[PDB]
Design a protein around this ligand. Sequence first.
Ligand code: YHS
Length: 238
Amino acid sequence: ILQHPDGTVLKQLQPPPRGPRELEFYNMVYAADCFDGVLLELRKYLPKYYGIWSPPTAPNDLYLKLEDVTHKFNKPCIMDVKIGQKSYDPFASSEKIQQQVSKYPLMEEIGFLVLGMRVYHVHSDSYETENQHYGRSLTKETIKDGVSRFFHNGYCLRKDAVAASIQKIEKILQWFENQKQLNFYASSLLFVYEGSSGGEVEVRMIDFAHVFPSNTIDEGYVYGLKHLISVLRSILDN
Ligand SMILES: Cc1cc(C)cc(-c2onc3ccc(-c4nnn[nH]4)cc23)c1
């Protein structure tokens, strides 16, 4: 992810088949002639898509030009959460399944994994960050406190941002409960709130290298969303 001052990010296409698949996803959803109500509704929860982009001198180097979801914030607090019970897709080899499950064997049970967070603290005027090892260390016993960490500024627990997050996830959950044409693997929710304000949050779906046609509800994604909502709800009782 490369931030541009014009309020966009450039995401470099991952190696094949992942990068081409994510390009195809965005191209399908943002098709100029799309009249599918499911895909039109989905646009509200994605970064705005500005099409494929490559440097003027390097047609080989493929990027997606996407809305920077953090752009409108002064001191954005950012958390990336992978959603689902399986981080591998329906066409993974035995090797690949074992690789993905070993990366976080609690994915089936918890339904989400914190990929990282960047939290602005008022009283130090600085950012703590957690890398992928943080979320991969979280268990059933520590997931609530693990998630809570995102909402701790230098002073209080930002229950305002917690409640707003629930309300926005609920809309995304509503979309998932009203569609049976896409299943999403190893995709994420990007949380942003203002660290410098009240109840102002972004929650956007990102990372679509493993999105596939389906005939069913995305049950794994629904489970992950519902557990995440339940965890956030319990934090409101702190
Ligand atoms: C400052 C900052 C940090 C982070 C972690 C993410 C972002 C970010 O803002 N808008 C985004 C749209 C898409 C993605 C994306 N798609 N696939 N992978 N990342 C990331 C985005 C911005």
